[PDB]
Amino acid sequence: MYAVFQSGGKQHRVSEGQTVRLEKLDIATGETVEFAEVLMIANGEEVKIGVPFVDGGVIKAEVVAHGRGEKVKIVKFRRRKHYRKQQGHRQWFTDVKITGISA
């Protein structure tokens, strides 16, 4: 009982009732989201897509968090050339909980 869907430029495999941390979306922190882009659905029986993006499958998820990722430090250094640079990054993320998985 799990599905594979394309949301933020990368496939995610999520089972029913599981929380998945995917890339930032333009959704509110307490708003349900639409994923009609489902690449594969698996159950006790085997069902696969004859066409990309199934035909009627959909994923229902509720957004829970909109925080920022862990700090990443970017250090650029050139040996003997008197050049050093530092930078920081904190990628945004959107954590959602899968509430429903259609067929």
Partner: protein
């Protein structure tokens, strides 16, 4: 209002500080390049010096004279 007065934008530049760090830009002799006379302390050539070639103000002839009547 002493703690409210501010200067006009662009009135100050903070000056350039030489040889302070990497990211300050001009460190490592502070923008005077590598070895040479210009790199040394107190270096440089006097006015009109052309690398030993005869200076222009020495090549050209002197001419004319000063009239005192013109001053008065």
């Amino acid at each position: 209002r002493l703690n409210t007065l501010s200067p006009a934008e662009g009135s100050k530049k903070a000056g350039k500080r030489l040889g302070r760090g990497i990211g300050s830009g001009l460190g490592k002799t502070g923008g005077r390049g590598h070895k040479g006379q210009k790199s040394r302390s107190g270096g440089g050539v006097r006015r009109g010096f052309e690398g030993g070639q005869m200076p222009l103000y020495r090549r050209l002839p002197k001419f004319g004279f000063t009239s005192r009547k013109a001053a008065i």
